[PDB]
Amino acid sequence: AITPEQIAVEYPIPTYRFVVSVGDEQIPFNNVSGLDVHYDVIEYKDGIGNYYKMPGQRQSINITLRKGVFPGDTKLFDWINSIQLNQVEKKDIAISLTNEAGTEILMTWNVANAFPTSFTSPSFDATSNEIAVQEIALTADRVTIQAA
Amino acid sequence: AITPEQIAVEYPIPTYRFVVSVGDEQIPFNNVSGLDVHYDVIEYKDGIGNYYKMPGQRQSINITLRKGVFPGDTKLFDWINSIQLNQVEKKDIAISLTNEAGTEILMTWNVANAFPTSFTSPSFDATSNEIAVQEIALTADRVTIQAA
Amino acid sequence: NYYKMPGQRQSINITLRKGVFPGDTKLFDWINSIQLNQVEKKDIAISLTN
Amino acid sequence: GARTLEDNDNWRYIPVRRLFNSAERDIKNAMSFAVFEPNSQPTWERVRSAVNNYLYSLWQQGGLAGNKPDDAYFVQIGKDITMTDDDIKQGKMIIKIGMAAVRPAEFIILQFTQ
Amino acid sequence: TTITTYPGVYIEEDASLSLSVSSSATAVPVFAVAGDNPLISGKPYIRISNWLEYLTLKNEQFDPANTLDISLRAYFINGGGYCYLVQTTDLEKQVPKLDDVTLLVAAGENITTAVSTLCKPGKGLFAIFDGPTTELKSDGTSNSDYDPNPFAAVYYPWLTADWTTTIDIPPSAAIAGVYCSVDSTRGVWKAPANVPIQGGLQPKYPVTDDLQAQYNQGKALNMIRTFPKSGTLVWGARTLEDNDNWRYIPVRRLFNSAERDIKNAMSFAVFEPNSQPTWERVRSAVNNYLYSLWQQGGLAGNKPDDAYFVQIGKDITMTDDDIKQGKMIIKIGMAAVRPAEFIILQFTQ
Amino acid sequence: TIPTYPGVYIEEDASLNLSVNQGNTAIPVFIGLFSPKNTNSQVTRVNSWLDFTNLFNAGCIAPITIVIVNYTTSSDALKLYFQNGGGPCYILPQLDRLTQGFLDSIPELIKQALEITLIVCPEWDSGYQSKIYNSLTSSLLNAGYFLIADNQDKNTALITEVASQTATYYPAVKVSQLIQAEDSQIAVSGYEDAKTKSDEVKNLAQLKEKNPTVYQQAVQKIQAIQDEIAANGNIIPVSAVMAGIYCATDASRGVWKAPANIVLSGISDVAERLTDDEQGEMNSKGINAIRYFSHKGFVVWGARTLQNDDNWRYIPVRRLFNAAERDIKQAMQSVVFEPNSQPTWERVKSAIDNYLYSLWQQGALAGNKPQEAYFVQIGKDVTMSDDDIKQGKMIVKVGMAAVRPAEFIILQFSQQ
Amino acid sequence: YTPSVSHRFIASFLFNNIPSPLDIAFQRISGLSRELQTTQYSQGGENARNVWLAEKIQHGSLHLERGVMTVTPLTLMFDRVLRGEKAVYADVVIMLLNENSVPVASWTLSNALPVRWSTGDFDANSNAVLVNSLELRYQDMRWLGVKV
């Protein structure tokens, strides 16, 4: 016998229920990926056989969000189309694993100072049975994980 | 209970119903893809640990249109065969997601100053059961989205 | 400003596939007739037929 | 001197009056394909694309005032926005275009001091 | 000249001044103005963007016999940004109407009552006073009339320049310009002292180390002194309260700026559902700002965990009664860096 | 223009139109001194700003009765309503003098138009607004109608017949300029002389060419009005602006979201600058404030109603229940003449349960599971009795739970 | 501290205090440098330190690259000088533009003398634009602006 409260404390979390906040606005998304952190390695060897390894510089964070195409909605394209020369509005992004009903947060991924670098429009195929899906690519500085 | 006017407002749009305008003329196409926008990233680092990222230059737009082979029709090949040395007629291209009957536009992709760079003829296979399909590749300047 | 123009046209490469029939070596004879840089050039037409 | 015969905030300068004359002619030639076409929404979208494509090109050349195209021009066309049921039934298609022109510097003042 | 008829070049020979203007958001002062001034009469407040705008609105030549004119010239020549002019009697009524005002500057007036009312915890205001116009009393009782307010500071003595007459420039006007320049250059956490005073401004009276030793504790006075090689400098960064907290101007003013910036950062959460998803969004916004502030160098600590912390949640910061009343409570604790003030040289052979 | 030849015509003008929005849960009715282009007292549906100008004469001068003239803000208030996201609306023009017969007929006229949800009176006159507000009977407001009102004072709240169904806002807003109309667009009636009947003069243009003496009589009143409005500033009632914000918020976020923390557009300044302490007094009394913030601009900073209790204190809570009972009533109208038997009651319960579940899915209701968000009850010995059934009655009980907004956020700072 | 990109710039030539409006677009402009020539001096008993003596200041040259286009006043000036006619001077202002076409940094060169004009190769196998290369030598350099 296992109580639902025990499951909420000891069991792992699935991936399909999440809510994404872009800036100060919340937008429903179909897919989010790329929240990785990488470092370089600095090595040093010497004549008598020593071998030193240290962490290097952290690389930049790259993110791809996938969304369907809805009538009258062009928010994501309007963001990437606002780039003038090298100026763009940078937004913080939060992705949270959520209660099955959406009223409770379980884990939060925080992304700071993200701006778009690429936008992919849907491919128009006359033999397909899918939904038009747009994709946006973002470059950011930092990623942090906060436990609720 | 969900009313059809609710679906037209809240539900996402599929990909299989679209109309393509090439120049001032409309041509039925089977597949359209490649309407993407890309930017470069310019980075700057300093000795005290700062790290700046900015959008760079926008890249050029590439588009491929796929169409069947019809009797007496060579319009797409005639366009690419009109190149003299570096002069060719550039045309604007609009791809619109359409009402199921074609009497109403939902969303438009506008492509400016496109000219052909490649043309692929159908492959003649004696064991196949397909339709002869030609493909044309275009280079453009800009892509915009207008919501109807 | 940003200007784009067509450039030079590239060369055309074509592959033909055919079965092997008794006593027929016509295709191999054509490629075996190259001397140093001389070869007989032929026009080729492919027509969709009734 | 570059002033016309009317002293008004509009059409005071020859460049502003002549720019609008050129834009009206070029736009009229741009969407002249739409005459004797069905008077439905798909035609209206095609006309809007033709006008917007021209206005962006004019702004790129420097003929309009504004840091971004949204500040230099706007195009409106649609039902209950530019035309009503009576206009459509009469065969009329109505478009609104609004563009901002750049006005030159005319007086130069030098202030001298010791 | 001012009447343009023909196209071409116009020549005029004027003598109007021309200065430069900076932009600091954390230093937006309000200048107390005497009610007898014709410019301010009949209006609640006047916003001045630069010296050009002030001269245009004045419609008069620069008068060194006007206390308000010299104060604005001293303020703008020192790098100050746009400011507000409010009559002294209307301070307690018009200051709360203005939202971006951070400094309350006494441009030679008496604003003792306004400071005791406006400059309170949570109001996000800082006051700049004027020191005595006479010589400093050696008994240490020249600061008895100032309230021990941690939100105010006093500067002595008054300043003079080449363009001076029987009236001397109040030190508050020049100091408020220093606040704008330091904040835009080195940040609000850096002490607004040990910096030159621009222009030809000079202290009216000389202050030595012995004189300043009496007025550097308790209700401390900040001196403006001249040194043999560095010119005229601001020598002092202490508020009117001598406590382990708010002893120094930078610590008090940094918290004022952070409270305002955090308040603006999470103002989107008002009139939102008072549930946990909202609380997580607010925590993300506050943590994002605090990390950025630590990155700039405004907080003390080798890692962010040593510089700040944010707590919000049920049974951590609020109870059932708080939630049912519509209250959302967050705790923020940030460590400020305190400057080195005394340098001791030990010589030996 | 009148087109003759096929082709392209070119016109130079200054006419302005705005984008048209749509909605169902927020359709306001405007009562004021409007000037319809047609003589024929009845509520008229207007789909957009272009439709309004096609059916009404836009301007700041009310129709002239022969002389007296009146100043009206109805046209400018409607432009603000469309600029803030408003959709289709109904217009109830009041003509001639304000008779009690018109006031008594207002609740019946509104009920005749079946799509009305909001009531707005966009008039600057305080006495005129007070008469209209008092004409809204408690039966009309309790039937699922919401009143947006303009408070004329900072210290005393408005009094209406139903406190739960009213929201007041303060202060009014200013605009850069007002809409000016040509002489041919200003309605004139009542003129008569020996050679002309009373119906031969329709506007100011015809009046000018028929009798310059009384024309100079009218234009001096018009010029006096224009001078007076210029001195005090072009002040517009804020209720019309709030109607558009209600439409925009419902379409974007939903009815359950408070219509606050939204930036106003198309305005220039507020009629009065408020402090936090003054706003504190008003909020307790139930007066929402339009505040100015440097980092935002002009925003709505209140979501309370005129009733202060744990049930109907907040606008989103009150408006959500109005939307739920309206949609439930619409579903229940297909059961009205069905036989009063148990299979009919089962179909009623299924219809309400399906609607309430859909409401909970979007986040309108509170709770982690549907059992915590709503309940439906109907039965032969649970809600109605044998006498009720024999009389043709059908009684169903519905309960819902709503989410209250967060109004105060407290920061607690520590040194270490 | 935000740095500036190097792909948005303008150059203006003044001939007899009349700016040339058709000579503002260039593919490349070389950087401008100033050097203070110095000679190292060594004392008698000083064997551990160095002494550097200041001298005159040496200015660099101005290099521009541009495609082949219609004849402009800048071209006519260059042709006249390189045809053996009397030498003539020009004043050049180089401006670095931001996203609002406001020159954040600007350099003005006094009395610039055309000294070289070269063109690219006529290559039958290439896919490239014929580019002219211009070089000038000026007497003085001065920079004005808020950035440098």
Side-chain angles (χ1 to χ4, degrees):
Chain A
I2 291 182
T3 302
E5 292 53 72
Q6 305 189 230
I7 295 167
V9 168
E10 304 154 16
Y11 274 44
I13 323 176
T15 36
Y16 60 88
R17 188 62 74 238
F18 60 98
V19 52
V20 190
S21 188
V22 172
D24 71 335
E25 196 190 337
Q26 282 192 309
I27 301 165
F29 280 98
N30 171 258
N31 187 33
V32 175
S33 147
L35 287 149
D36 314 343
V37 171
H38 300 275
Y39 282 78
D40 300 86
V41 184
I42 295 158
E43 331 212 356
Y44 179 83
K45 287 178 171 177
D46 90 8
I48 49 164
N50 303 313
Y51 195 178
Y52 304 99
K53 289 169 220 74
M54 318 144 254
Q57 305 211 51
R58 192 211 302 151
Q59 294 166 216
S60 67
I61 272 74
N62 282 82
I63 270 179
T64 36
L65 324 162
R66 270 233 298 290
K67 193 174 142 61
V69 169
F70 284 78
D73 177 62
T74 50
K75 281 182 38 33
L76 291 185
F77 182 79
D78 283 346
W79 189 16
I80 196 170
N81 209 50
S82 78
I83 300 180
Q84 284 282 100
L85 169 79
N86 57 333
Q87 297 282 321
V88 71
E89 211 218 323
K90 302 192 180 187
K91 305 173 193 285
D92 322 71
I93 300 187
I95 304 105
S96 307
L97 289 179
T98 321
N99 170 11
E100 283 178 349
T103 64
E104 155 142 338
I105 309 302
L106 308 180
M107 191 135 279
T108 310
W109 279 255
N110 281 306
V111 168
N113 295 129
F115 62 97
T117 79
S118 161
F119 185 85
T120 287
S121 323
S123 101
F124 304 86
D125 183 2
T127 53
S128 100
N129 254 276
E130 319 288 331
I131 284 293
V133 172
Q134 63 215 11
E135 163 149 277
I136 197 158
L138 310 157
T139 290
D141 308 346
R142 199 184 62 260
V143 170
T144 52
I145 299 187
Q146 156 87 38
Chain B
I2 292 186
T3 303
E5 294 59 32
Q6 279 156 54
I7 292 163
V9 167
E10 316 169 7
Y11 274 44
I13 321 178
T15 41
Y16 54 94
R17 189 65 71 239
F18 60 96
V19 54
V20 183
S21 188
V22 175
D24 70 336
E25 195 192 337
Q26 279 171 328
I27 303 169
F29 276 99
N30 170 249
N31 183 28
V32 177
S33 160
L35 296 95
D36 308 340
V37 176
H38 295 276
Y39 281 79
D40 297 88
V41 184
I42 299 156
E43 285 146 314
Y44 181 80
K45 289 180 181 178
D46 88 9
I48 49 164
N50 301 312
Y51 194 2
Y52 305 99
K53 313 173 194 67
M54 334 159 207
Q57 306 215 57
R58 197 216 301 151
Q59 276 144 48
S60 71
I61 276 81
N62 284 53
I63 273 175
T64 43
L65 322 156
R66 275 233 296 281
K67 182 194 180 0
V69 168
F70 286 77
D73 168 78
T74 51
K75 286 184 69 309
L76 292 187
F77 183 78
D78 284 347
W79 188 17
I80 196 163
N81 213 50
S82 75
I83 303 182
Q84 285 284 105
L85 164 76
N86 59 334
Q87 300 282 0
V88 69
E89 206 221 314
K90 304 193 182 189
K91 306 172 195 283
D92 310 331
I93 300 189
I95 311 107
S96 306
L97 288 173
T98 326
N99 180 22
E100 278 175 349
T103 65
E104 153 166 351
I105 305 305
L106 308 176
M107 194 168 258
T108 309
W109 280 253
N110 282 305
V111 168
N113 288 129
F115 62 96
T117 82
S118 146
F119 180 90
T120 290
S121 266
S123 64
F124 308 93
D125 181 4
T127 52
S128 80
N129 256 277
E130 307 285 13
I131 285 293
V133 173
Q134 60 215 14
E135 166 158 86
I136 187 162
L138 314 164
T139 289
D141 278 312
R142 193 193 353 112
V143 170
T144 54
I145 306 188
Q146 156 85 41
Chain C
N1 302 318
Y2 194 179
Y3 305 100
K4 307 173 191 66
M5 314 153 237
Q8 307 211 56
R9 193 214 302 150
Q10 298 163 215
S11 70
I12 283 90
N13 295 50
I14 270 175
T15 40
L16 318 185
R17 275 231 298 280
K18 177 168 184 281
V20 169
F21 287 75
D24 158 87
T25 54
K26 203 184 315 263
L27 290 189
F28 181 80
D29 288 339
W30 187 19
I31 193 166
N32 209 53
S33 77
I34 305 185
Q35 283 285 100
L36 164 77
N37 58 330
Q38 306 285 321
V39 73
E40 211 221 328
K41 300 192 180 189
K42 315 211 227 256
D43 313 303
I44 302 186
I46 312 106
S47 306
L48 284 176
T49 324
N50 154 57
Chain D
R3 287 198 173 210
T4 83
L5 278 160
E6 184 189 297
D7 201 359
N8 176 23
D9 248 11
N10 314 357
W11 333 121
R12 210 207 298 287
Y13 298 108
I14 292 172
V16 186
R17 175 71 264 164
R18 264 171 61 73
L19 161 73
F20 269 74
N21 272 14
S22 178
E24 284 157 2
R25 159 168 323 240
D26 289 346
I27 275 151
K28 165 179 174 177
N29 290 353
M31 39 132 290
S32 98
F33 73 96
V35 192
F36 303 116
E37 291 265 334
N39 194 5
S40 43
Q41 205 224 40
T43 306
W44 307 339
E45 297 321 292
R46 286 171 77 204
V47 179
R48 191 221 294 271
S49 293
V51 173
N52 263 311
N53 280 351
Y54 169 79
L55 282 178
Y56 189 95
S57 165
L58 184 63
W59 170 81
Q60 234 170 21
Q61 290 180 268
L64 296 173
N67 282 314
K68 37 200 201 70
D70 315 303
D71 293 326
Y73 61 90
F74 70 88
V75 187
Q76 316 202 249
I77 173 171
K79 183 131 168 48
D80 273 314
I81 301 170
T82 51
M83 40 177 176
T84 70
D85 318 306
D86 314 315
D87 306 305
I88 286 143
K89 89 150 64 74
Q90 289 164 50
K92 285 152 81 187
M93 171 203 320
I94 310 164
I95 325 191
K96 281 199 28 73
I97 302 156
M99 30 199 277
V102 46
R103 282 148 173 82
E106 180 168 50
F107 319 100
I108 295 189
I109 290 123
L110 313 163
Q111 276 158 15
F112 280 87
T113 181
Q114 332 266 311
Chain E
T1 69
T2 326
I3 305 305
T4 47
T5 70
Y6 59 92
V9 176
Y10 291 71
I11 313 283
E12 57 210 61
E13 327 214 299
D14 79 324
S16 83
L17 256 181
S18 175
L19 314 175
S20 56
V21 52
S22 179
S23 176
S24 190
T26 89
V28 182
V30 46
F31 287 90
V33 198
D36 51 72
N37 261 242
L39 202 134
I40 204 55
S41 73
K43 274 148 297 318
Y45 48 80
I46 288 273
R47 182 192 152 137
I48 296 300
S49 311
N50 46 51
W51 190 249
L52 207 155
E53 198 197 20
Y54 176 60
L55 283 210
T56 296
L57 295 203
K58 208 182 140 81
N59 235 328
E60 270 145 275
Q61 83 300 329
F62 171 77
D63 167 44
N66 184 30
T67 167
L68 187 269
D69 259 32
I70 56 172
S71 291
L72 262 299
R73 187 190 180 160
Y75 165 77
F76 275 126
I77 203 46
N78 277 274
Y82 78 94
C83 68
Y84 281 93
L85 321 163
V86 170
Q87 311 191 113
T88 305
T89 37
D90 294 356
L91 276 182
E92 313 87 332
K93 257 185 76 77
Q94 307 290 329
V95 160
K97 269 162 180 91
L98 309 164
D99 197 32
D100 40 341
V101 153
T102 71
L103 290 157
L104 176 56
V105 164
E109 318 274 83
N110 185 4
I111 62 159
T112 298
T113 323
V115 166
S116 66
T117 285
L118 296 161
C119 298
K120 313 201 68 39
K123 296 293 172 289
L125 271 167
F126 201 82
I128 279 162
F129 276 112
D130 283 330
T133 49
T134 77
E135 293 331 88
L136 283 208
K137 305 183 217 146
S138 309
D139 55 5
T141 80
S142 201
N143 59 341
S144 37
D145 37 355
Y146 298 113
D147 265 290
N149 201 341
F151 288 86
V154 199
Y155 285 88
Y156 173 92
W158 293 45
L159 307 172
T160 60
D162 273 319
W163 34 273
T164 322
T165 320
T166 165
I167 47 163
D168 39 356
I169 300 159
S172 57
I175 285 309
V178 167
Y179 279 31
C180 298
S181 53
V182 172
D183 289 21
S184 49
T185 303
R186 305 191 56 173
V188 76
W189 50 91
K190 155 76 185 26
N194 201 349
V195 283
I197 294 207
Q198 312 286 345
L201 311 186
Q202 304 268 327
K204 235 184 83 168
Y205 306 126
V207 181
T208 63
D209 283 355
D210 272 323
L211 257 170
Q212 189 163 20
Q214 303 296 130
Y215 300 106
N216 205 69
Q217 65 257 315
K219 327 207 265 209
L221 310 161
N222 305 303
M223 276 44 166
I224 319 189
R225 296 171 53 182
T226 288
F227 290 100
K229 215 90 58 174
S230 46
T232 310
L233 305 170
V234 190
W235 218 238
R238 288 200 171 210
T239 78
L240 280 163
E241 185 189 300
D242 201 359
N243 179 21
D244 248 357
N245 321 340
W246 331 119
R247 206 205 298 288
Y248 297 116
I249 295 171
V251 182
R252 174 71 263 167
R253 262 172 58 75
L254 162 74
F255 269 74
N256 269 17
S257 174
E259 284 162 349
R260 161 176 308 250
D261 283 350
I262 294 181
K263 167 180 174 177
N264 291 351
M266 47 99 99
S267 94
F268 75 97
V270 188
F271 305 118
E272 292 271 334
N274 194 4
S275 46
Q276 206 225 40
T278 309
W279 308 338
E280 294 323 293
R281 288 171 81 202
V282 183
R283 189 218 297 275
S284 293
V286 174
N287 264 312
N288 279 352
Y289 171 80
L290 280 179
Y291 187 95
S292 164
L293 180 66
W294 171 81
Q295 215 152 237
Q296 291 182 268
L299 294 174
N302 277 126
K303 37 202 199 72
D305 315 302
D306 293 329
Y308 62 89
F309 72 90
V310 181
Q311 320 199 249
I312 175 169
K314 181 133 169 49
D315 277 323
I316 297 168
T317 56
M318 33 179 185
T319 70
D320 318 307
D321 313 312
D322 305 303
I323 284 144
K324 87 149 64 74
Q325 290 161 51
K327 283 154 84 185
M328 198 208 292
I329 308 167
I330 329 183
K331 257 212 64 52
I332 304 158
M334 25 188 275
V337 48
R338 282 138 178 79
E341 169 169 43
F342 317 104
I343 286 98
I344 294 126
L345 314 165
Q346 280 160 14
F347 281 83
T348 181
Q349 328 265 308
Chain F
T1 195
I2 319 295
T4 60
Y5 51 91
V8 181
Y9 294 70
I10 288 164
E11 302 187 354
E12 323 256 32
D13 68 347
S15 49
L16 174 277
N17 39 276
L18 310 154
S19 38
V20 47
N21 322 108
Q22 81 282 9
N24 210 46
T25 165
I27 295 172
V29 60
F30 298 93
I31 320 162
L33 328 173
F34 286 93
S35 166
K37 268 163 159 107
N38 174 26
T39 58
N40 317 46
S41 167
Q42 59 179 19
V43 197
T44 311
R45 168 159 191 119
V46 160
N47 281 298
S48 79
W49 177 253
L50 177 75
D51 221 30
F52 167 72
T53 53
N54 224 62
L55 299 169
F56 292 81
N57 299 305
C60 63
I61 289 296
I64 300 177
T65 280
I66 307 195
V67 296
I68 43 57
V69 310
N70 275 334
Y71 165 67
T72 168
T73 62
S74 63
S75 284
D76 279 85
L78 216 80
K79 187 209 69 202
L80 281 178
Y81 158 76
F82 283 118
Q83 278 188 309
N84 277 279
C89 57
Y90 285 73
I91 287 172
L92 178 51
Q94 184 264 356
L95 314 160
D96 291 346
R97 215 207 326 121
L98 195 50
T99 67
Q100 188 84 29
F102 177 78
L103 296 193
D104 296 340
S105 72
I106 277 175
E108 213 49 43
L109 287 165
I110 296 206
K111 291 256 195 56
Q112 277 172 9
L114 311 120
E115 313 62 0
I116 309 290
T117 316
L118 299 164
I119 302 159
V120 169
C121 175
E123 293 292 343
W124 181 220
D125 182 278
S126 65
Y128 186 89
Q129 280 195 308
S130 173
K131 255 171 262 178
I132 281 191
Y133 294 159
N134 276 277
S135 100
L136 312 176
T137 57
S138 51
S139 68
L140 168 62
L141 298 181
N142 284 323
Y145 291 82
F146 197 90
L147 170 69
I148 308 178
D150 302 289
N151 219 69
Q152 67 139 301
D153 171 38
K154 204 215 323 304
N155 320 268
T156 309
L158 198 68
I159 306 276
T160 56
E161 316 257 2
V162 185
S164 288
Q165 302 269 58
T166 310
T168 64
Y169 293 88
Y170 182 84
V173 299
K174 295 191 167 85
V175 299
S176 48
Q177 75 311 9
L178 302 176
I179 294 160
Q180 304 288 340
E182 273 107 8
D183 314 329
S184 75
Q185 288 223 124
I186 300 195
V188 177
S189 87
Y191 178 82
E192 200 201 334
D193 65 80
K195 308 143 296 317
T196 70
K197 214 242 182 181
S198 71
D199 59 354
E200 307 177 28
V201 181
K202 323 291 281 162
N203 46 18
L204 214 71
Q206 294 159 6
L207 196 284
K208 178 174 65 62
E209 49 75 9
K210 262 197 173 173
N211 191 343
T213 311
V214 291
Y215 169 76
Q216 287 310 315
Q217 229 177 335
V219 303
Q220 145 274 303
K221 282 204 198 71
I222 287 176
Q223 186 56 50
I225 275 184
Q226 294 276 35
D227 268 1
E228 176 62 272
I229 196 45
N232 279 6
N234 317 320
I235 291 171
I236 313 292
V238 80
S239 52
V241 169
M242 290 313 299
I245 284 179
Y246 278 32
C247 293
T249 314
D250 290 17
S252 157
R253 294 289 302 271
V255 187
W256 45 98
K257 206 264 173 199
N261 214 4
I262 314 291
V263 187
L264 279 73
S265 79
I267 75 156
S268 147
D269 194 32
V270 294
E272 175 171 28
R273 294 299 194 85
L274 296 170
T275 79
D276 285 349
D277 284 24
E278 314 175 320
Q279 155 79 111
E281 300 273 49
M282 303 169 19
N283 195 260
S284 90
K285 261 170 284 207
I287 309 162
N288 309 295
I290 308 301
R291 297 287 301 277
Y292 173 73
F293 294 132
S294 300
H295 69 87
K296 283 223 76 182
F298 299 109
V299 287
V300 188
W301 213 241
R304 283 215 209 296
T305 75
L306 292 181
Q307 175 152 323
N308 194 3
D309 58 341
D310 276 5
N311 263 13
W312 310 114
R313 149 152 46 226
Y314 293 115
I315 298 173
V317 172
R318 179 70 260 185
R319 291 238 292 139
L320 159 80
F321 265 86
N322 289 358
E325 290 298 337
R326 169 168 294 243
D327 284 352
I328 280 174
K329 157 177 176 185
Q330 180 109 39
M332 275 318 84
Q333 274 179 342
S334 67
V335 185
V336 167
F337 285 106
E338 292 311 294
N340 205 357
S341 71
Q342 206 232 23
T344 310
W345 310 334
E346 292 313 286
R347 288 202 266 126
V348 157
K349 162 142 50 199
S350 285
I352 304 189
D353 217 299
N354 278 348
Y355 173 78
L356 283 177
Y357 187 89
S358 95
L359 209 51
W360 170 76
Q361 266 196 317
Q362 329 176 15
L365 305 171
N368 284 339
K369 50 170 181 161
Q371 298 104 73
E372 289 161 8
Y374 61 88
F375 74 90
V376 189
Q377 252 171 345
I378 173 170
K380 153 91 137 43
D381 256 16
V382 188
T383 56
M384 74 213 87
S385 70
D386 257 313
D387 312 57
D388 306 305
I389 298 160
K390 207 209 174 32
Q391 285 169 36
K393 267 184 255 171
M394 199 172 0
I395 302 171
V396 50
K397 292 200 200 297
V398 181
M400 316 195 309
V403 194
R404 320 279 138 127
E407 220 163 4
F408 326 107
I409 312 173
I410 291 138
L411 303 179
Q412 312 188 313
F413 278 77
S414 84
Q415 190 72 78
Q416 104 280 357
Chain G
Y1 290 2
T2 297
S4 304
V5 296
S6 53
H7 66 264
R8 169 76 20 105
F9 55 96
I10 204 139
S12 76
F13 291 76
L14 297 104
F15 316 113
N16 309 288
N17 324 58
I18 287 131
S20 186
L22 304 174
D23 294 307
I24 55 157
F26 291 91
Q27 173 192 256
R28 193 193 208 81
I29 301 182
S30 79
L32 312 155
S33 68
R34 291 173 299 181
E35 180 180 21
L36 176 64
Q37 319 216 93
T38 48
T39 82
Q40 190 184 351
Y41 184 63
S42 33
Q43 264 201 90
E46 182 80 85
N47 306 324
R49 299 173 60 101
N50 297 162
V51 166
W52 298 93
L53 306 175
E55 297 212 327
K56 325 232 186 171
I57 285 151
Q58 183 66 24
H59 291 294
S61 33
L62 175 77
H63 289 89
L64 309 137
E65 316 188 353
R66 190 173 75 165
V68 166
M69 77 192 30
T70 324
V71 180
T72 71
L74 169 70
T75 279
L76 291 169
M77 145 169 260
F78 254 82
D79 201 41
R80 277 193 227 101
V81 173
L82 305 176
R83 261 204 284 102
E85 280 185 32
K86 281 262 303 167
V88 279
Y89 285 153
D91 292 47
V92 191
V93 183
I94 319 279
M95 315 175 230
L96 183 83
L97 315 174
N98 63 357
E99 82 263 357
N100 310 307
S101 296
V102 167
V104 283
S106 92
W107 303 263
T108 165
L109 331 173
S110 321
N111 294 349
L113 174 66
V115 282
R116 221 179 98 81
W117 182 310
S118 182
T119 199
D121 291 15
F122 304 92
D123 195 32
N125 290 76
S126 67
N127 280 287
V129 158
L130 198 60
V131 159
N132 300 301
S133 194
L134 323 176
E135 194 212 50
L136 295 92
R137 290 168 147 130
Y138 54 89
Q139 298 184 339
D140 209 356
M141 191 262 268
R142 173 70 58 262
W143 87 268
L144 318 88
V146 288
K147 286 152 149 263
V148 52

